[PDB]
Amino acid sequence: IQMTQSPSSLSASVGDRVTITCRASQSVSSAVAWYQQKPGKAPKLLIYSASSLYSGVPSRFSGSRSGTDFTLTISSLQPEDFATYYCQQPSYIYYPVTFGQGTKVEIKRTVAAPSVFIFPPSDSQLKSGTASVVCLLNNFYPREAKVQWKVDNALQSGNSQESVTEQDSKDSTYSLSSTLTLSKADYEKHKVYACEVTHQGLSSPVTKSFNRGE
Amino acid sequence: IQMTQSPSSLSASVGDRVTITCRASQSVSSAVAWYQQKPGKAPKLLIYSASSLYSGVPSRFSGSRSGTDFTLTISSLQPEDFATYYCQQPSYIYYPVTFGQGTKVEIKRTVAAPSVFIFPPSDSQLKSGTASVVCLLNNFYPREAKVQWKVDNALQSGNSQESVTEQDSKDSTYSLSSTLTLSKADYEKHKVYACEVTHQGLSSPVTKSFNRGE
Amino acid sequence: IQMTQSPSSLSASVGDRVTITCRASQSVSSAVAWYQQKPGKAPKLLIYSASSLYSGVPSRFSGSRSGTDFTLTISSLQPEDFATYYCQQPSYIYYPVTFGQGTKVEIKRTVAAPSVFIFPPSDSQLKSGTASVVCLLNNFYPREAKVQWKVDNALQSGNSQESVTEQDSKDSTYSLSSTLTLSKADYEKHKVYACEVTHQGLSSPVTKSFNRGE
Amino acid sequence: IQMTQSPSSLSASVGDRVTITCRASQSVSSAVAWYQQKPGKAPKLLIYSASSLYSGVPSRFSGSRSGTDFTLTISSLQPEDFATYYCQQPSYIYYPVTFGQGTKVEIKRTVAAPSVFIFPPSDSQLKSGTASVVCLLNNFYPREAKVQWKVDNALQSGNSQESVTEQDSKDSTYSLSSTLTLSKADYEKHKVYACEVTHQGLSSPVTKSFNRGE
Amino acid sequence: RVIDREGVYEISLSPTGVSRVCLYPGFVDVKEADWILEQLSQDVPWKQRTGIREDITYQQPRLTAWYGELPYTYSRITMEPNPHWHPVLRTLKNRIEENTGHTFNSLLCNLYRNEKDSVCWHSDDEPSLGRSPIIASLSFGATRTFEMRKKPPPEENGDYTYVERVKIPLDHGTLLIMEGATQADWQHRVPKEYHSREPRVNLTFRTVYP
Amino acid sequence: MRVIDREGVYEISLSPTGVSRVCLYPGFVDVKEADWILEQLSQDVPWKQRTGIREDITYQQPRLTAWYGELPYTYSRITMEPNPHWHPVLRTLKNRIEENTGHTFNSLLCNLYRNEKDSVCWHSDDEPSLGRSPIIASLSFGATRTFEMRKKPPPEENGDYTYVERVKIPLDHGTLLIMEGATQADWQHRVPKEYHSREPRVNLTFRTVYP
């Protein structure tokens, strides 16, 4: 069960013109605000009253209203403008406030294939009754990448959890780590463990295998 | 606001061994049920009591329990086995019942690049005050693909809604349709409309453009 | 703490017409039931729906309504009609049910003075630490009678309990037994014990006394 | 539904020795209080700690304890001692307090027969739709008295309510008034109304009648 | 069209808007409905009321009673508002409100003594009901037919002939709800029958405004 | 010899210790729910065949057992490992019993009688960790078996096993039994083997264990 949605992604380079959009029907107000939020920091107010800029906002930011649609436009995208933007729906007085789906703006780069590393579970963890096999996808682009677990050529699903890093500040690449967790008995019930990685920068899916205890 | 999650995907070929796990920590019961649901049809019961086959279920399906983890294994994948599998968590008597995240099992296919087509809004729709531009990606694999809208070389976001067809039963390809909707006033303020498509089967992004009134 | 009341008494002779009324202000229903209960037996249904005779009820019974007042009338009082009558207040559907105060109908009789007997406590009871002196009022009418205990001409109150026999079926007379219970210590510290009876059939109060150890 | 009981009566003459007991089995304490309350006045504290006289109480009052029984004794009864006496059960610290049944002590008097008067309802009251016939029992002794209503020689019950005054300060007699209330229609449906009075001071019951409209 | 199944039916979409009717057979259980019928037949202050149309005074061919704090005047006749709702009626009101989600403050009780009693074609569009009222109808006793006809558009000008007709059988304990444009765009009635009918009690809940 | 098969409260003796009271409630659990509970408890409870001791000897008890609670229970000279995590159904039943009977419990002993050959022989539940005059509640599922009771002889008769008052209480599917008062001090009970086929029976015995 979740309350809100994950922010959608938007790939753009420096100098591009970006026009996000909100959408509120049966709207009859111009009291729409825009916010920008960087990772680890609180959101900051950008535009209020559909088009009025807040003190200390560059002139490249602009807001427009066209009927029930509201717009945030960045004329020239700068490196410090890559973040998540939230649209506040028309907030009437005495009525509740609603925030729209965030729009994450990431910086475009050249396609980079992931470097795949596989780590068998350490003996200290086997001494506790659990085994965690991790598969690393290091420094790649774009974000979408598929990792497929297979034990003795038996395709696994549901027993793995993956985590994705934020977009890097230097090279603008991503990193992914998927962890496969089994019991000690179930880990010792199979031989070959492998994670197959599929990515755009790879013409064919790459496989990183190892046999248990080698 | 959403109550459940969208089913995870698993790419598999015919004849492979698929093992779907269903984690339920702190479980002290073996009353786990498994269900199969095909597109558009109601679910049918597969396994009850963690491992007991239901009447009229093929012998290739088998369920086992490993401590607090429950699993459903298909020994030999058949063409009629490609569907969504839901796990019913340990349902104690007098207590509520919870269904886990579904696992969508799709058939693997060779790489297929999408055929991109863009359709301008009809004059009959412009006669009403709204313009809907649709971009088509026909017969491609895999499912993952990104479509980017550009009006006068300005990147758009939030003003598009895309729909993806089910995996075809014959060719095992997908189809995607993204619709860009704006008002007539804003529609007649711009010239060039284009949808740029990025996919694994394309070494470079494909762009389908058109100018307003041609 | 008590939940209900003791039934009120009504003195009437055989052949008289008896009209028991059941007041229920602000009532807007005719769903009133009447019941008859003889000592030791379950109640019997007499009238339902305010005026409908029940199967097996003599035609001398009749129920009537007068605005917000409800009435049960016995045209000719029979010897087998002397009992307590309970009125079930207007019972609306989905709402609770309430029984009114019982009206006990006794048979009228000539004035009969009580025969007063006093019984001292036996020595076998004195061997246990408690002494119970009982005063008997045998075969009298009407039911109302007062008994006063006096020890060394000291008026007692609260140390005595009394019980009255149901109206006899043979002579239509009552009997009363009052018991005075004290500890051994207080019993042997005083001399003269007397029971003074006041009743309608006695022009002057009757005293039945005895001295300790005779 | 009743929470407490009406105070019991004790008939006593001036100069008599009165002893009231207040059983309270399971008594592990001597923190028993006695109170005196006169009609229309607030109660007054008499005894505390079972036996200790309170400041301003004559020495004729005395409290004693005999095992689990507590007593309040008046050695010589004076005219100002006739009232209702309440016993406070053993009140432990931190635990609730309970008061026993009051003991109303009335002054004994010679037998006085009641003067019966019947009043027909006034025409001003018939102008409103209800008729109230009142039967007066004036200046009698003892308090014991029965009133029986008869319309066309039909015994009535439930439609009458009686009220009794306190014992007079000069003659020590009581007075009772019973009111019989009917609707205008029911009042106009019958002829002869009568209230039958039974009392100690009457060798035979007295009947006071009147016919409607004379 | 004949409708006898539990469900929500949108019977028309124009000219005013969506006309919606909802049918709930067995809303009151058989034994309770039997008892309620018996009680309301005994306790409700049913009257045969007057009207006058062509200067001749007449008796309506049905019994009626009204509950609520505000008056209700239809067909030039006026009903005296009753402040004290019968407890059963209050209970049924509350049950309807909790289950339907709509509130009411006025109840009109109709008793059709036999097959000769009826109510003719009308809409419940009295202005003190406000624009587009929500009306709930609960039935007890013998089955009678609730007929509905759609109003003609202003071209035909009162030609209730070549127009849509809907019949709804109302059985013992069935609840019917009308909402939306139903009163603006449709009329209804309960016709007389030519075979024996036992008595029928109908409860019609409305909201009356100042 | 008394036979009890009616719903009711029965005072089976009044001396020497005091009132011995047993309360029977047939159909406390409805048939279908009792069926489901039986299946569930047979599958989920960690049933084990445990050892007894007697007097320097060793034997397998002719019944399976499991324990729930935060405190240990030691009978037949063997201790059962207390389970802190009560099965949710067992919790629910515990709470139901408490709310309906008015007595509280913190300990549950589970007995499984696999077939007619399983049994528990004569004993009283007078272990000192039960306290003075314990309240014990017994809930049964599965095949009917007979709960037999015999009154203890007084110390003048040197433990005569015969001629004392005997009581048999059939415990049918979904029947709740409550024991209170002097029942454990003055009576013994057992569940005998049977000589015809019996399906499995699961019994739940709730009690309060003190430090």
Place this chain on the structure above:
Amino acid sequence: EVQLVESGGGLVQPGGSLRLSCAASGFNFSYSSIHWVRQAPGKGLEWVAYIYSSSGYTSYADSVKGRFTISADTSKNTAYLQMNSLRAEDTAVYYCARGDSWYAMDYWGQGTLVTVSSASTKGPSVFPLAPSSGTAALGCLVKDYFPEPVTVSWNSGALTSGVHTFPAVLQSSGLYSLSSVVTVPSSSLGTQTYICNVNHKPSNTKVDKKVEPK
């Protein structure tokens, strides 16, 4: 042949209500558990309530408790679900499923649609997606219809090869919109006529639109 039939679904306003019924055909209820499970479009299963028909015990989901009421009538062999205070998130396909045991559901119904929204029923508008230079690309845009579902065929069902009818999408206006495309040889564009057939049963609207180049 032992099916289940659901009834009572449809369109309701937020805060409105519905009463779903589940008729058991071919077999019987009692000594079984009756479950209700809903499924939002493209989401996982969500159990909402069950009932044990033998005893009447009921259990609800936390996202439902207080609002819904599940029951069963052994007399009619029909289960009911009284849904009150309906919200927007309650819109889903509702399934009724049996279940010999207390959890394993073996008989499922086909499911009924329940839509909770403030929007009213409206017929669809169809716009042509005319082909241009592209080998085989045309379609129809069925936009602004409510509620679901709608069926689209081509040439009365003659044309089915290469037809992609996309799943419906829900716009911000509260109305649904989908596209149905088909790929045909370009050589037949001047010779072969293409007409899409749209059938919206909820609004009783039948619209055919001819697709031609320009």
Place this chain on the structure above:
Amino acid sequence: VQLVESGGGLVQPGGSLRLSCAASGFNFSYSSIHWVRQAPGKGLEWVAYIYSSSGYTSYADSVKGRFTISADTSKNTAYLQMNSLRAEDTAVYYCARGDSWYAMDYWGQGTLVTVSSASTKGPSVFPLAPSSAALGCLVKDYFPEPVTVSWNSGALTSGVHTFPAVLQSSGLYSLSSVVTVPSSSLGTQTYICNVNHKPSNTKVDKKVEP
């Protein structure tokens, strides 16, 4: 001129909390104070606001009835009483500035509120040993958030990837921190990851070696 939040932490489901929002450098007085939460990796969700001059309050649909917002201008602090907390209430809670009725110009740093049945537990670290390069540490089974990982007391930072935490089915969090390096270094220099979990007062250093 900042906003500071306090009172966040760990609570059991069904319990309660009261977040506090201290205003510094300017006073709310005549103003609107908003509360917005954000689940890990999710969007913003307004939950409540209050108008400080009149005291009018408005709550989100997923919160109404359970939470209670207030403020005391005498102490210049806003409060949010969260009652009957459930698992889905777990998010980072921000406090909001606006002069307007909606435009929030001043935001706080935000406090984290976790509603879970799990209890505080220190992390277990296992070495992700390199082979025939990359290595790392597996920080598994810790609770609650957050936890910090450095390499060689902060000396090694180039090529370090500390992944976001994941919530396992057991109720405990788990992450991994890896780092890239070249082949020759393995065996010539040491690598030690430093884990610091302030809620449990647990600091563990683990050397990663083949």
